[PDB]
């Protein structure tokens, strides 16, 4: 599999470059630990590491782990914002709290987003997530 590419520790361009990888931070070992981390990847003929997003489990660090972490965080952000918008709708001036943000209820929801997909499927199953087409405002069709 992946015959056009090579493992990095065999690709001699990768060794010739990773002998001289520049240290990003003040740690002198930064280029060396970069080389040690990138040697386990799949490098091209030019020596730079290439990532596979097909869904290979051994390439889970290439796509799968950061994608599911981004999905978890994006669901946290979206559910916190959605629950804040649902809660502040029943107020005297819901536009005021949208532009001068009420801190404590926002903080209460911010430390409340660690169970978001269960809340999402519960709100979907209880009809609190999707409205009807007749209920929403529509342009002249």
Partner 1 sequence: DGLKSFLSTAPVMIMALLTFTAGILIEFNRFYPDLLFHP
Partner 2 sequence: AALYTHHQYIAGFLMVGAFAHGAIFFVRDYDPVANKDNVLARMLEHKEALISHLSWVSLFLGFHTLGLYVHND
Partner 3 sequence: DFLVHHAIALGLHTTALILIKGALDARGSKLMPDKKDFGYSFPCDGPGRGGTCDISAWDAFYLAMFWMLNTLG
Ligand X SMILES: CC1=C(/C=C/C(C)=C/C=C/C(C)=C\C=C\C=C(C)\C=C\C=C(C)\C=C\C2=C[C@H](C)[C@H](O)CC2(C)C)C(C)(C)C[C@@H](O)C1
Q: Pick from 78, 86, 96, 108: which binds ligand X (CB under 6 A)?
A: 78
The Cα-based distances of 119 to 16, 43, 67, 79 in angstroms read 52, 42, 21, 9
15 binds ligand X (CB under 6 A): no
Q: Which does 100 bind (CB under 5 to 8 A by kind): partner 2, ligand X, partner 1, none?
A: partner 1
Mask of contacts with ligand X, 32-61, x by CB under 6 A?
Answer: -----------------------x------
Binding to ligand X (CB under 6 A): which residues in 104-123? Answer: 120
Q: Which residue has the tokens 């801190």?
A: 103
Coil, helix or strand at residue 6: strand
49 binds partner 1 (CB under 8 A): yes
CB atoms within 10 A of CB 81: 13
Element of type H or E holding 49:
strand 49-50
CB atoms within 10 A of CB 123: 16
**Pairing outcome for strands 42-43 and 6-7:** antiparallel
Mask of contacts with partner 3, 118-137, x by CB under 8 A?
Answer: -------------------x
The contact set with partner 1 (CB under 8 A) reads 24-25, 27, 30, 33-34, 37-38, 40-41, 49, 51, 60-62, 65-66, 99-103
């Amino acid at each position: 599999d992946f015959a056009n590419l090579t493992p990095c520790s065999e690709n001699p361009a990768y060794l010739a470059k990773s002998k001289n990888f520049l240290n990003t931070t003040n740690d002198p070992n930064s280029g060396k630990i970069r080389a040690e981390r990138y040697a386990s990847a799949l490098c091209g003929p030019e020596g730079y590491p290439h990532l596979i997003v097909d869904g290979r489990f051994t390439h889970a660090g290439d796509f799968l782990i950061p994608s599911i972490l981004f999905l978890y965080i994006a669901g946290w952000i979206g559910w916190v914002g959605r629950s804040y918008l649902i809660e502040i709708r029943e107020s005297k001036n819901p536009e005021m709290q949208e532009v001068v943000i009420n801190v404590p209820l926002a903080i209460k929801k911010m430390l409340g987003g660690f169970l978001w997909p269960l809340a999402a499927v519960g709100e979907y199953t209880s009809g609190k997530l999707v409205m009807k087409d007749s209920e929403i405002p529509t342009s002249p069709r």
